Amino acid sequence: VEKRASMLLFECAEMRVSDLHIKVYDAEADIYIRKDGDMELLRQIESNTAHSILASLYNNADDSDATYKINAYQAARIVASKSRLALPPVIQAVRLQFNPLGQGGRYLIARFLYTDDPTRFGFHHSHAESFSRMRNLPIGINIISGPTGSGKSTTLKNLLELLYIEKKKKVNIISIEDPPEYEITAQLPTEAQRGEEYRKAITAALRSDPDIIMPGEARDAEVINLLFTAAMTGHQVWTSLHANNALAIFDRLKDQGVDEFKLTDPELITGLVAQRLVRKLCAQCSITLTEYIASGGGISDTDRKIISGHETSVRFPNPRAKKCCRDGYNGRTILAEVIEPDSKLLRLVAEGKREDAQHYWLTSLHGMALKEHAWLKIISGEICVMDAVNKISGIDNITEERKKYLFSRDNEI
Amino acid sequence: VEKRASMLLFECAEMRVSDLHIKVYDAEADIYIRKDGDMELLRQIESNTAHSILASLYNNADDSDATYKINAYQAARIVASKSRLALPPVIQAVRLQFNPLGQGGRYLIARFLYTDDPTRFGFHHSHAESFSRMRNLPIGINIISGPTGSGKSTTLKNLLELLYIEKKKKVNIISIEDPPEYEITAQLPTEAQRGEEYRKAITAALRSDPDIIMPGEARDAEVINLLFTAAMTGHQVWTSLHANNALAIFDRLKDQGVDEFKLTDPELITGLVAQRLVRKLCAQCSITLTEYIASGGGISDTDRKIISGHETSVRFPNPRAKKCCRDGYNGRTILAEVIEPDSKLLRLVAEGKREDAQHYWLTSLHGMALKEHAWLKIISGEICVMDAVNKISGIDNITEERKKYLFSRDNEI
Ligand SMILES: Nc1ncnc2c1ncn2[C@@H]1O[C@H](COP(=O)(O)OP(=O)(O)NP(=O)(O)O)[C@@H](O)[C@H]1O
Ligand SMILES: Nc1ncnc2c1ncn2[C@@H]1O[C@H](COP(=O)(O)OP(=O)(O)NP(=O)(O)O)[C@@H](O)[C@H]1O
Numbered sequence: 001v002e003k004r005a006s007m008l009l010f011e012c013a014e015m016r017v018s019d020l021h022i023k024v025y026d027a028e029a030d031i032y033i034r035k036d037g038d039m040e041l042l043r044q045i046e047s048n049t050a051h052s053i054l055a056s057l058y059n060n061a062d063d064s065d066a067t068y069k070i071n072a073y074q075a076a077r078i079v080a081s082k083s084r085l086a087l088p089p090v091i092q093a094v095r096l097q098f099n100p101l102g103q104g105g106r107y108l109i110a111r112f113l114y115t116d117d118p119t120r121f122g123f124h125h126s127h128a129e130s131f132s133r134m135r136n137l138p139i140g141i142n143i144i145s146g147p148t149g150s151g152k153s154t155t156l157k158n159l160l161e162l163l164y165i166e167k168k169k170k171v172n173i174i175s176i177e178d179p180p181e182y183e184i185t186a187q188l189p190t191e192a193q194r195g196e197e198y199r200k201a202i203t204a205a206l207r208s209d210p211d212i213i214m215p216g217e218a219r220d221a222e223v224i225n226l227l228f229t230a231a232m233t234g235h236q237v238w239t240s241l242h243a244n245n246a247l248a249i250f251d252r253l254k255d256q257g258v259d260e261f262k263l264t265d266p267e268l269i270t271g272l273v274a275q276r277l278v279r280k281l282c283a284q285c286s287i288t289l290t291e292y293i294a295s296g297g298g299i300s301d302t303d304r305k306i307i308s309g310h311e312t313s314v315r316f317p318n319p320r321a322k323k324c325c326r327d328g329y330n331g332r333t334i335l336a337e338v339i340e341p342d343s344k345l346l347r348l349v350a351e352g353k354r355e356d357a358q359h360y361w362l363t364s365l366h367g368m369a370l371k372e373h374a375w376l377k378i379i380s381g382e383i384c385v386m387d388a389v390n391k392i393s394g395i396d397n398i399t400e401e402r403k404k405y406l407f408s409r410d411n412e413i
Numbered sequence: 414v415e416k417r418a419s420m421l422l423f424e425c426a427e428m429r430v431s432d433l434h435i436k437v438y439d440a441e442a443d444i445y446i447r448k449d450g451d452m453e454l455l456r457q458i459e460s461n462t463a464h465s466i467l468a469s470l471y472n473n474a475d476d477s478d479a480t481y482k483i484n485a486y487q488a489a490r491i492v493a494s495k496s497r498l499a500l501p502p503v504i505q506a507v508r509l510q511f512n513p514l515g516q517g518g519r520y521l522i523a524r525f526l527y528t529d530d531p532t533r534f535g536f537h538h539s540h541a542e543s544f545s546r547m548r549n550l551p552i553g554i555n556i557i558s559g560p561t562g563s564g565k566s567t568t569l570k571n572l573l574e575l576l577y578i579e580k581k582k583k584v585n586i587i588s589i590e591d592p593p594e595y596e597i598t599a600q601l602p603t604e605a606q607r608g609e610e611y612r613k614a615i616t617a618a619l620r621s622d623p624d625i626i627m628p629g630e631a632r633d634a635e636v637i638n639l640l641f642t643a644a645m646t647g648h649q650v651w652t653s654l655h656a657n658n659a660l661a662i663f664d665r666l667k668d669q670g671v672d673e674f675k676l677t678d679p680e681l682i683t684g685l686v687a688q689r690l691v692r693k694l695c696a697q698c699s700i701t702l703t704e705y706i707a708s709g710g711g712i713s714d715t716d717r718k719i720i721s722g723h724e725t726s727v728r729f730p731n732p733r734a735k736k737c738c739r740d741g742y743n744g745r746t747i748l749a750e751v752i753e754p755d756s757k758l759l760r761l762v763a764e765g766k767r768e769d770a771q772h773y774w775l776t777s778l779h780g781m782a783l784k785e786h787a788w789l790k791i792i793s794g795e796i797c798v799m800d801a802v803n804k805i806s807g808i809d810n811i812t813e814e815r816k817k818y819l820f821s822r823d824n825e826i
């Protein structure tokens with residue numbers, strides 16, 4: 001039924017979920033939504049209605065092979081301005097993935113791409129200073145790394161507005177994003193055809209005077225090679241990648257053929273940012289450790305080790321669903337690490353040491369990693385310890401001297 | 414005759430054997446079964462009846478070339494829900510391998526794939542702690558290694574239930590197993606076609622949001638490359654491999670093209686497990702060393718060296734087939750080694766030293782190898798020394814200081 005699918009899509013748009021999952025078990029079908037970073041169960045619908053709405057979603061999808069193919073895997077895309085499903089204006093495009101499940105079952109995954117203050121989202125002040133210093137440099141390449149729900153596009157858009165303000169419209173800015181998402185310059189619009197179109201758009205942007213290229217993501221190795229050659233040509237590149245800890249970026253680049261002599265130059269690789277998104281506790285409804293352990297308190301030994309020393313400072317989510325917010329959580333915040341490479345740091349990284357290179361960054365360069373930022377926001381009470389240790393590993397490995405140094409540097413500023 | 418083959422399959426299912434071997438010598442045919450880890454002789458059947466039942470098994474098999482091909486090698490598969498042989502519900506699929514044997518003889522091998530408490534199967538407490546620590550980490554790749562009868566699928570299923578309990582259904586779990594074996598998430602279902610289907614299923618699982626990928630085995634190099642790229646993308650992988658001693662995993666990976674820069678990072682390779690299955694003595698019927706040597710005692714010099722120091726503690730199988738159990742053995746237990754890699758350990762392994770790297774793991778990392786666990790279960794009396802030295806080599810090479818340290822660490826806990 002088209003109507004039930006339309007109501008489901010409107011409900012998911014108004015509730016602002018990220019992904020939608022539908023699992024059919026031939027008795028009852030589970031409908032799950034991905035709100036913020038955690039998954040939750042939406043509904044237990046009937047199997048026949050779920051099969052009907054999945055069939056309708058496949059039929060009104062733009063890509064279809066005229067076979068439902070219960071036993072076979074399928075992919076499809078629904079694009080706005082041509083849709084009999086009467087899509088809401090909030091959702092621009094929906095990417096549907098259909099998978100077989102057991103015997104006569106279906107698994108539908110929907111990505112729900114959306115078509116929709118100047119600074120200090122969740123970053124530290126040192127990260128803001130590094131961002132300003134990186135924006136002041138005319139020549140270089142910047143790479144943003146993290147998992148899928150990092151929010152790299154929002155950071156790139158905010159940096160683009162900051163470049164608008166700072167540069168006084170004296171430079172040319174080009175933006176090459178195949179899916180138009182959010183206001184952002186010249187917005188330049190199967191998988192192989194999309195990749196070929198993206199490569200053609202990048203080449204056409206390079207034929208003109210790009211100054212700042214601002215590419216969208218980096219899937220292919222040829223794309224990254226073209227971006228690197230344009231960066232050594234004399235332009236500025238702000239790209240995004242999938243990596244961890246702001247040092248696996250080099251591992252993700254050497255896998256595709258960037259070669260070691262390009263990554264050694266500190267003038268080329270201007271900055272590296274690795275960020276993650278975690279849920280933020282509501283400020284109106286927060287409880288102390290004693291109030292948390294008073295009613296159903298569950299704390300592990302590592303969590304107790306992290307809290308120890310600042311037991312009164314930490315905060316926990318408040319149950320009972322008070323008037324403010326929804327469930328004691330108010331949005332999300334970014335924990336990030338920003339590195340400005342040096343000659344010695346890049347020389348140590350290129351040798352593949354992986355030891356005394358992170359130490360050099362933390363001690364000599366006065367750098368801060370993602371674990372220290374997560375611990376600082378744990379002590380400040382902005383985020384819960386359980387969410388931080390679920391998202392990030394290694395928080396309990398911070399030494400006492402490092403914690404004392406971080407507290408001293410936070411108090412002296 | 415279909416009836417005799419049906420009775421043979423029912424007998425093998427009720428007796429719970431692993432593999433079935435039929436050898437034809439044109440005078441009398443040997444029927445052998447693989448119960449637990451050891452092979453034994455089931456029956457001495459007539460050659461004509463064996464040829465007839467093998468011909469019937471080939472004819473009712475799904476794959477057939479309409480030629481019996483006595484002189485040629487053949488392979489076939491029998492799948493449930495489409496079988497004129499009236500398969501028992503316990504057996505899902507049977508893989509038949511037919512080989513020539515001498516002049517006019519046949520060799521049939523049947524794998525007998527079966528379609529069918531929360532922790533502490535045979536693992537040590539340190540292994541359980543390492544398992545919990547590995548389950549707490551959000552990003553990484555875990556590899557389970559061992560011979561064919563290790564029981565890696567059972568360990569992976571138990572870890573999946575433990576992840577169900579721990580994660581509180583806040584993450585998405587996908588399972589990609591081409592043969593559906595045992596309850597386990599979204600269960601995603603010639604050799605080249607099967608490999609292509611497996612690769613397509615893995616790609617389709619990667620197109621959605623996998624979080625935890627949980628792949629089934631690793632046959633091809635492209636599959637392992639895709640798993641590694643997904644692990645550096647930011648997902649978690651629990652895969653199984655065929656290797657020994659938890660350090661030949663790197664040798665099995667470098668053979669297929671993982672490259673050295675991917676294996677150096679300790680944040681990527683989160684843990685390595687190598688396990689084996691040995692027979693456990695029945696607790697009701699156990700005899701001491703004196704009772705064993707009283708009647709038909711056969712002990713070697715190396716076995717005497719291993720037993721020496723704890724002669725009264727060891728136990729031996731009890732003959733005469735008492736009321737309990739079957740032959741003095743009660744099930745099987747796992748002897749395993751679990752390593753959490755470090756930067757120095759991975760640097761030493763990547764250099765190909767093979768010396769002072771195992772020493773670093775045993776001394777600095779306080780690790781325990783499979784030989785020490787086997788010796789500890791020998792001293793505790795859970796398993797027999799002969800089975801342990803048949804399954805595992807190098808038990809007699811443990812020094813006296815290491816044995817004293819193991820006994821002290823077992824007594825202090
Ligand atoms: N402080 C915040 N910073 C960034 N994003 C936030 C923040 N708070 C909430 N969000 C939301 O987090 C969501 C993730 O942003 P998004 O740019 O879509 O991630 P992404 O890296 O582009 N995902 P993908 O393209 O699939 O790899 C955004 O839609 C934000 O609305
Ligand atoms: N403590 C135990 N732990 C694991 N398996 C056990 C144990 N006790 C008995 N078993 C049985 O050992 C058998 C081997 O398990 P299995 O998962 O089939 O090994 P495998 O590694 O998957 N073999 P293969 O796929 O051919 O490489 C299982 O069927 C168990 O029933």
Ligand SMILES: [Zn+2]
Pocket residue numbers: 282283284285322324325326328329
């Ligand atoms: Zn609130």
Ligand SMILES: [Zn+2]
Pocket residue numbers: 695696697698735737738739741742
């Ligand atoms: Zn017994």
